[model samples]
Target: GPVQIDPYLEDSLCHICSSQPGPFFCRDQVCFKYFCRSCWHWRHSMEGLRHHSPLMRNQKNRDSS
Candidate 1:
């Protein structure tokens, strides 16, 4: 089955990386695994999960405190 996507509805500027539109929108001040489809694909190929996991950074701060 072919998956359907709406780019205009889905794309948004990421808070962290202002250069590109983010697919993920924050909810309740908590970062989740959400990303724009295009950004997500690029992040995956670029191994950005390790360098750009917002959730991980938040967790690190919590652990430090």
Candidate 2:
């Protein structure tokens, strides 16, 4: 990992689908983009992109009483 710089905005939309929420953010600066879990694996099938790590968000759980 390198120096941490935080950012996001119109980033809500997945770069692949451009509609669904993009949770899986690519680690590679060259491939810096957001992609849903489904699209991430499918689209990042190439050898160069296969090793790219995805940074995902933690899911919240709601407990009903």
Candidate 3:
């Protein structure tokens, strides 16, 4: 089957690396664009996470604590 390419879906890609295709997401308003866990870890800091409270995809209602 051919993969369906959606322009709106493309917007969900990692703004930093453009590698992640968005099963993961960041809630930090600055890093509003969705990204992979690896890139997310590399890009964010504890201070920033606590402050911005970035949310990830498909998880229990866990806080960034």
TM-score of each: 0.26, 0.58, 0.45
Tens digit per residue, CA lDDT, model 2, 1-65: 44333555344567676787677777576666778878888877977777788875432333444
Q: Which tens-of-lDDT digit does each residue in 1-49 have in candidate 3?
A: 3444335435465666776565555555566567666776766654646
Reference-based lDDT, each prediction:
0.44, 0.66, 0.57
Mark the 10 consecutive residues where model 1 has the least summed lDDT.
Answer: 54-63
- Give the clash total for candidate 2: 0
Model 3 global lDDT (CA atoms, 0 to 1): 0.57
> Model 3, residue 52: what's the lDDT?
49
Best by lDDT: 2
Candidate with better TM-score, 1 vs 3: 3
Q: Write the per-residue lDDT of candidate 1 for residues 1-65, one digit (tens) a residue.
A: 34443453454455445676554433322334345656555655554244443221112232352
Local error of candidate 3 at residue 56 (angstroms): 4.7
- How much lDDT does candidate 2 score? 0.66
Against the true structure, whose TM-score is highest? 2
lDDT of 1 at 46: 51
In order of listing, the candidates' clash counts read 3, 0, 3
